[PDB]
Design a protein around this nucleic acid. Structure first.
Lengths: 165, 213, 68, 125, 208, 141
RNA sequence: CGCGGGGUGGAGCAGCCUGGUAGCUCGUCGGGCUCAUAACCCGAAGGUCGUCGGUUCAAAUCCGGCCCCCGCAACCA
RNA sequence: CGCGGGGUGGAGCAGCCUGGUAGCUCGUCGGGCUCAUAACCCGAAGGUCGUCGGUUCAAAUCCGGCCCCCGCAACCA
RNA sequence: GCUUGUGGCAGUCAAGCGUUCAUAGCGACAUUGCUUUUUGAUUCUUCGAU
RNA sequence: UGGAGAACAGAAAUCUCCA
RNA sequence: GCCAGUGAAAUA
RNA sequence: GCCCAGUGCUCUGAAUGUCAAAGUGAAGAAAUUCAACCAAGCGCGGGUAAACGGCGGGAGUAACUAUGACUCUCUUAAGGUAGCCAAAUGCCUCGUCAUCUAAUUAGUGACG
RNA sequence: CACCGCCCGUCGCUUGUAGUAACGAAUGGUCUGGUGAACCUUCUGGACUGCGACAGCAAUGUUGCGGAAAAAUAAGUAAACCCUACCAUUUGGAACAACAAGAAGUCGUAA
RNA sequence: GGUGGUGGUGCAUGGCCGUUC
RNA sequence: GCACGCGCGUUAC
RNA sequence: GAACCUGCGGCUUAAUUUGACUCAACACGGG
RNA sequence: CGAGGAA
RNA sequence: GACGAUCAGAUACCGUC
RNA sequence: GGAGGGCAAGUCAUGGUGCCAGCAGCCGCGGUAAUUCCAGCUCCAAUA
């Protein structure tokens, strides 16, 4: 056995702006209200070409939820990507994860659902074991349970019934 | 003029009358001065009694208002109105801000202005007789209206005004004028330098004058 | 310049001269012909104010025949 | 998850309907703006019909190797017909022929609307 | 340059003048193999090598000249397919010069040479049998160059060459490198394959 | 009376006066002051010389043109001469170092209105009249 | 440090003693005028009043505390 | 050699401290204008930014290492 | 005064020049040296006379 | 650091997952 | 006057 | 010749700021410690170089070519004026051209 | 070609020119102080030779007389040469400079 | 060797028109 | 044809 | 001065036909 | 655009 | 010559010495 | 040796050249329809 296992971690939602405001000042709102939770911005540890020549500050939003709003992630899983993600073909492990690109668009724009445009198409796997070694007090190494996502965390994005296998 | 003659305004001036013996009823003396003559805003007062000791003498309707909740902040007592739909038309100017802040005592309302007080509401009224003073405006304008009604002490704000007292009919001299001074504290002096800041004044009781300087 | 020497003559098309039909009498004869073509009494006859130019016959074949 | 105006197929059946006579069946008529309707309901040319078929052969014969045979034309006055979508027609502008991939969106619009007739202005002095 | 007086000795431990002596007047011999490179590792066998017997500083430029005249002939009578003249010295130690008119002066770098330990192999190359004297006569050249020196020795191995190891590689007819342990045989040694071996394999591990 | 004196005894006066007031004449003042002998030809009418080089000179005022000129070295005199080579192709015959015969242009002094500082004409090349070289049927070397 | 005077467009100067308006010249930028060419003229862009706070309805403006500038004064072991 | 300044059309000068555009004059070459002739004007051809590399999305531009140029400094046995 | 790097001066090997030929006349590279009228190091002798 | 999702980001300036 | 009072600050 | 900013000198001058001793005021119980005014001087104003002394620097800049009376500039009082030289001042320098020699690191005459 | 007309100078540029004075040299001429070939004349000198007398008839010899070559001499005419002054005629010379002429160069505007 | 030419010279010209008015 | 510079005008505060 | 309109210049352009330039060019070539 | 500077 | 003013420029036409 | 004027003689609707080559004694010719250039033709002058 086979007593317990399978659940949906968290819905790590993230846009990657690349300015201050009133731009990030948006990817926020957007995130925030697709979210219900608020918006943990993102730093900016340091500099170079394509702008982003700022100290760790202002250049993306993090807000990422979990649990009951489980399906709230696959709330465009199937949808957004027709329930098809990095498929084919070796070891049935087709890039455990799913491609992406930035997101956004909204000063007027209309709610969603899909829309909001492509987005952070991941928040995914890596096998199993236990429950709280990410604990506190008497911490620990999870068990020796399950398969490196893949041969396990694939057969549970395969019973959300969709393409990748 | 802060001289020997203080007890000429007090001792020698305590049984002047204007007729025969000296009557047969109670007495009523004091010691006139002011509040600070500053401008009823920036700096002119703080805390600490003299005394002194008194209250009204005649009326006390002063100033307290701001919102629809400031009316009840003048209902179980009696004060002036700042209005609601007037701070954007006519709740301040000259005879306006006056109205609400121009009574006799000073002010005991709260605060709420924003970007308007450099020449209108909060502004035009200061040395007139009010400009947001210390009246513990948080629970209302009654408990701190112990500093705005009775006891006292002698809250001296707005335009001049204050109080004084020591004895009754006749039994004070060095401590009569020195009782008038005693009837003065954070109004005759205070923190960094304040032993004097005026020119003259008045005093008596009911008799006739006091200091003839 | 320099090399531009005689630019003109070099560029000129050398035309040939009308090989003498007959001859040009040289002697009292020429002075005679002239005397006849101009100071002979038939020309001193018509007005001395309306007699032609000793070269109006610029060699014009059309006015050459009209006169003769 | 994107779709198209009024259903690319309904129109192939709408255009090539029972009476696929005049290039623009009275069906497609209900769809076009007054100016276009005006023209067709008025007097459209036949050449515009042989040009039609020239795209036809280009769309099928070409393998799924997505390499369409560019069809050349001066008929800049032609209003894209439903079945004209997908083919790359070379349209003359003034200098040469312009190759344009016909999308579903450019229908009811004048074929000339894509063959830039002049190069706008850059600057400096 | 300044002659070879700042020449072969010691007088100074070894100022490899890296991180600590920044200004190393860049090298002189940025070559090393100059020859029939990308070789067969069969083919151009039997190597003759040039050993130096004298704890010296075979200078910078000097090693260059070596290369120069080295290749010069190497090729000039044998071809671009003939040589492969492995440098095999190499020139650290930044030496220095001198220049308050006589009061305490350290050197400023002044050219990098290298320590030929007496017995060490220098600019030594490798080629096929039919090149013998070819190579040999040639290396002579150098010995005549370069603060000599000189082995012009004929060799063997190991296997930097042919190279005796003669009976060896001529024995490892069958194979190349490991060998080594005995397990994941991904060096197609022949011939079955895995199955059989992996039989015998543990068939002995088991005998313990 | 006028300025001049009318005495029968005063001939001398009138005489000296004329001899004096006469210096005011250039034509006079000219030949009288052996001026003719100091010019490049030393009075002479013509002079032989060797071509030092063919140079060209620009026309003046309303004219613009490349004039053909030869810088010559006169024989016994030994002076640098500016000499204008006449008609059309002319300079095409003058080879450098040949012998040339030069003469002046209209009264020795002002050059032809057009020319600048040229005062001489070239008439012979290697002792061959130019005109001769100018007309085909005549001469050439 | 102690006395006393001062930081206002990009520059040089005004406005402050007499609280509500920030001006002049140059420079930058555009136009007039003219038969035309100079000249000449108009109109724009541009100041956070060193900086921080206080009086005040209102502060470049009066008042302070810092930061540099100049001038006086000066005794350190 | 140690300090510091510099190589940009064929020539003489700009652009570099303020990275994205290489300009002016002469010269070469063509045309205007004019009744015409000078004059005058426009438009073209032409730079690899000494040379080698590094940062960099991008280098004549900032940074180096070489090659000459000028200026300082200098003790060789 | 040592020392001789640096100066100067000779020398071996012979690839080269020297149109034909390495050495008549010269010689790259590389290498051995002499020199103490350069210069540079050094501080021994002499400021309690050079 | 790889492998994941990119709309002013797109070498990245900055945003969220994971070994 | 003042209970009304505006404003930069209300007086006999 | 031109420079009065610098250093010096020197004038009634400056509407105002320092500036010692006595003298004055204020405070203590005094000793004593705070005050205000206060000669010169200083600093502010002017003249002053047959007073000490001073006397710039880079860019462009046609009618082969190099060129500067041209203008642009950044700039401190002023920016070397007449005049004068490889001179007893000139670095490179044995300057370059002459001249005097068979010959000149000398002479002299030039040129900047 | 008529004030958007004429026009002046500085500097520059373009194309050119060698003047006047001085000096150098050449030719010629003169002066100053010397050296001085040659020759007329002069005083010498006298080979050689003519005559007469004597030693022999003769070649020869002595002497007297006369003409007379070389040599030498003084005053003179004075060639050439040198030195010292001066004249005449020619001819020479340069970078920088200078002069000449021209222009819708440059700066202004004198008239 | 012509036709024809909104091709060039208004400073080669007619005709016409503007300006001085 | 558009970074812009002129000249009749149209509409208006 | 404003937004349009129209002419002229300029700069683009395959090409943006060209005339005209102070009143005596520029909604003028009936543009 | 809130009646428009030099002209 | 020293100064004021005028001018784009004025050691010039005016003004103070 | 000339043919615009002085200075006798082309009013050729001539060819080439285009301020270039050149003419010109002095005026002045020449910059695409040259009466002065180059040349043809015809003319003029003095005429071995």
């Amino acid at each position: 056995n086979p007593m317990r296992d399978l659940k949906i971690e968290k819905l790590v939602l993230n846009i990657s702006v690349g300015e201050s405001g009133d731009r990030l000042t948006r990817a926020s709102k957007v995130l925030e209200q697709l979210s219900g939770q608020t918006p943990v911005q993102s730093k900016a540890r340091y500099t170079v070409r394509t702008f982003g020549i700022r100290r760790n500050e202002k250049i993306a939003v993090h807000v990422t939820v979990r649990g009951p709003k489980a399906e709230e992630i696959l709330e465009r899983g199937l949808k957004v990507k027709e329930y098809q993600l990095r498929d084919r073909n070796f070891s049935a492990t087709g890039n455990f994860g799913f491609g992406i690109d930035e997101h956004i668009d909204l000063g007027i724009k209309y709610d969603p659902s899909i829309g909001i445009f492509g987005m952070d198409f991941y928040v995914v796997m890596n096998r199993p074991g236990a429950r709280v070694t990410r604990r506190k007090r008497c911490k620990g190494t999870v068990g020796n349970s399950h398969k490196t996502t893949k041969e396990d965390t694939v057969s549970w994005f395969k019973q959300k019934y969709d393409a990748d296998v | 003029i802060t001289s020997s003659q203080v007890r000429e305004h007090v001792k020698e001036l305590l049984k002047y009358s204007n007729e025969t013996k000296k009557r047969n009823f109670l007495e009523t003396v004091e010691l006139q001065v002011g509040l600070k003559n500053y401008d009823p805003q920036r700096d002119k007062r703080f805390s600490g009694s003299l005394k002194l000791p008194n209250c009204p003498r005649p009326n006390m309707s002063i100033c307290i208002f701001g919102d629809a909740f400031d009316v009840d902040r003048a209902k179980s007592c009696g004060v002036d109105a700042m209005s609601v739909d007037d701070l954007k038309k006519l709740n301040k100017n000259k005879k306006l801000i006056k109205k609400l802040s121009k009574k006799y005592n000073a002010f005991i309302a709260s605060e709420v202005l924003i970007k308007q007080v450099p020449r209108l509401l909060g502004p035009q009224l200061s040395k007139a007789g009010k400009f947001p003073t210390p009246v513990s405006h948080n629970d209302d304008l009654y408990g701190k209206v112990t500093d705005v009604r009775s006891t006292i002490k002698f809250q001296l704000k707005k335009v001049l005004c204050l109080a004084v007292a020591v004895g009754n009919v006749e039994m004070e001299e060095d401590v009569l004028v020195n009782q008038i001074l005693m009837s003065v504290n954070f109004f005759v002096s205070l923190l960094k330098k304040n032993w004097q800041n005026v020119g003259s004044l008045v005093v008596k009781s009911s008799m006739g004058p006091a200091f003839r300087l | 310049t320099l090399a531009k020497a005689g630019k003109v003559r070099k560029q000129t098309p050398k035309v040939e001269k009308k090989d003498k039909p007959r001859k040009t009498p040289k002697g009292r004869s020429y002075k005679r012909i002239l005397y006849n073509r101009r100071y002979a009494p038939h020309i001193l006859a018509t007005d001395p104010k309306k007699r032609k130019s000793p070269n109006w016959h610029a060699g014009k074949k059309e006015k050459m025949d009209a006169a003769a | 998850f994107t779709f198209r105006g009024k259903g690319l197929e309904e129109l192939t059946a709408l255009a090539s309907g029972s009476n696929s006579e005049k290039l623009i069946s009275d069906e497609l008529a209900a769809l076009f703006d007054a100016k276009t309707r005006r023209r067709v309901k008025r007097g459209i040319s036949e050449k515009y019909a042989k040009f039609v078929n020239k795209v036809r052969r280009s769309k099928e014969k070409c393998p799924a190797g997505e390499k369409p045979v560019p069809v050349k034309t001066h008929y800049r006055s032609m209003i894209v017909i439903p079945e004209l979508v997908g083919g790359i027609v070379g349209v003359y502008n003034g200098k040469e022929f312009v190759n344009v991939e016909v999308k579903f969106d450019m229908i009811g619009k004048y074929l000339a609307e894509f063959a830039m007739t002049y190069k706008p202005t850059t600057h400096g002095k | 340059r300044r002659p070879a007086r700042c020449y072969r000795y010691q007088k100074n431990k070894p100022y490899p003048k890296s991180r600590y002596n920044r200004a190393v007047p860049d090298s002189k011999i940025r070559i090393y193999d100059l020859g029939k490179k990308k070789a067969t590792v069969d083919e151009f066998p039997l190597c003759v090598h040039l050993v130096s017997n004298e704890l010296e500083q075979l200078s910078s430029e000097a090693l260059e000249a070596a290369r120069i005249c080295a290749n010069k002939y190497m090729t000039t009578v044998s071809g671009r397919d003939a040589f492969h003249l492995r440098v095999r010295v190499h020139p650290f130690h930044v030496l220095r010069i001198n220049k308050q008119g006589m009061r305490g002066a350290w050197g400023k770098p002044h050219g990098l040479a290298a320590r030929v330990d007496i017995g060490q192999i220098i600019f030594s190359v490798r080629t096929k049998d039919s090149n013998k004297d070819v190579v040999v006569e040639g290396l002579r050249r150098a010995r005549y160059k370069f603060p000599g020196q000189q082995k012009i020795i004929l060799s063997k191995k190991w296997g930097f060459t042919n190279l005796d190891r003669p009976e060896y590689l001529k024995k490892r007819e069958a194979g190349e490198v490991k060998d080594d342990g005995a397990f994941v045989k991904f060096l197609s040694k022949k011939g079955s394959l895995e199955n059989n071996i992996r039989e015998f394999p543990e068939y002995f591990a088991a005998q313990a | 009376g006028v300025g001049k004196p009318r005495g029968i005894r005063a001939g001398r006066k009138l005489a000296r006066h004329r001899k004096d007031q006469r210096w005011a004449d250039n034509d006079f003042n000219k030949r009288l002051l052996g001026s003719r002998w100091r010019n490049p030809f030393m009075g002479a009418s013509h002079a032989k010389g060797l071509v030092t080089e063919k140079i060209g000179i620009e026309s003046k005022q309303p004219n613009s043109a490349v004039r053909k000129c030869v810088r010559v070295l006169l024989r016994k005199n030994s002076k640098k001469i500016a000499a204008f080579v006449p008609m059309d192709g002319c300079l095409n015959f003058l080879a450098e170092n040949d012998e040339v015969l030069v003469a002046g242009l209209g009264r020795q002094g002002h050059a032809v209105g057009d020319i600048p500082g040229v005062r001489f004409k070239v008439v012979c090349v290697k002792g061959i009249s130019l005109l001769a070289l100018f007309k085909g049927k005549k001469e050439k070397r």
